[PDB]
Amino acid sequence: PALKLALEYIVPCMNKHGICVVDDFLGKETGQQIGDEVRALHDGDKITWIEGKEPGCETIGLLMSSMDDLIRHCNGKLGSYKINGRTKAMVACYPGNGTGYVRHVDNPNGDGRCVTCIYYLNKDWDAKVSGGILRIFPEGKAQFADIEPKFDRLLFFWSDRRNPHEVQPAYATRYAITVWYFDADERARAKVKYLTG
Numbered sequence: 001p002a003l004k005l006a007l008e009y010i011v012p013c014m015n016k017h018g019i020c021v022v023d024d025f026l027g028k029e030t031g032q033q034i035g036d037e038v039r040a041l042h043d044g045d046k047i048t049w050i051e052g053k054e055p056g057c058e059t060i061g062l063l064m065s066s067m068d069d070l071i072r073h074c075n076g077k078l079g080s081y082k083i084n085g086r087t088k089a090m091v092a093c094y095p096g097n098g099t100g101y102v103r104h105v106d107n108p109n110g111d112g113r114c115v116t117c118i119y120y121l122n123k124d125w126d127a128k129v130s131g132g133i134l135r136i137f138p139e140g141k142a143q144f145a146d147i148e149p150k151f152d153r154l155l156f157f158w159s160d161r162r163n164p165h166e167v168q169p170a171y172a173t174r175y176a177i178t179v180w181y182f183d184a185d186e187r188a189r190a191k192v193k194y195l196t197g
């Protein structure tokens with residue numbers, strides 16, 4: 001149940017460490033289905049933003065609705081954030097040509113995004129053999145964390161400067177879906193600069 005998982009794990013883990021992992025998020029059957037839709041969608045990296053209701057993206061929509069379900073039950077308990085929206089789903093295809101991703105902060109200048117959510121959908125992926133490990137350096141901590149892109153794994157972490165992260169090279173094609181949730185106040189201040197946007 002999303003309620004138990006949100007209050008007994010996600011909320012306390014995020015407030016304590018700012019990095020949270022949920023394994024076996026949707027089950028093998030749904031995971032494979034999402035892989036089929038992602039592969040059929042993508043058949044440097046390739047990026048596509050999915051709203052969830054497009055033809056052939058129905059199970060990606062279920063993934064997004066499941067994430068929303070968890071964040072909903074975290075209402076008002078993730079720090080001081082008021083999460084009132086999110087981006088589309090960044091459905092990314094990462095090439096296995098021995099390329100990694102430089103260390104970066106997702107939201108370094110307050111663009112409204114407060115929580116990064118990544119779902120990994122590569123069945124039987126063995127990071128020990130194929131690479132692609134995510135390395136997060138939580139600010140001010142004496143440790144850093146290597147997160148394997150395990151199949152059906154869901155990852156939460158703060159999007160701001162608290163979590164600089166880099167990705168190690170991979171040697172086989174892989175896919176991940178990222179979604180960012182907004183903070184009401186921050187996202188509002190970021191929208192003021194635009195005429196209409």
Ligand SMILES: CC(C)(C)OC(=O)c1ccc(-n2ncc(-n3ccnn3)c2O)nc1
Pocket residue numbers: 092094101105106107167176
């Ligand atoms: C256009 C905007 C500004 C929204 O782009 C981002 O903010 C953004 C995009 C991508 C990533 N990350 N971070 C890790 C990975 N990655 C790579 C392989 N496996 N995971 C990855 O694509 N982070 C932030």
Ligand SMILES: [Mn+2]
Pocket residue numbers: 104105106165
């Ligand atoms: Mn990132």
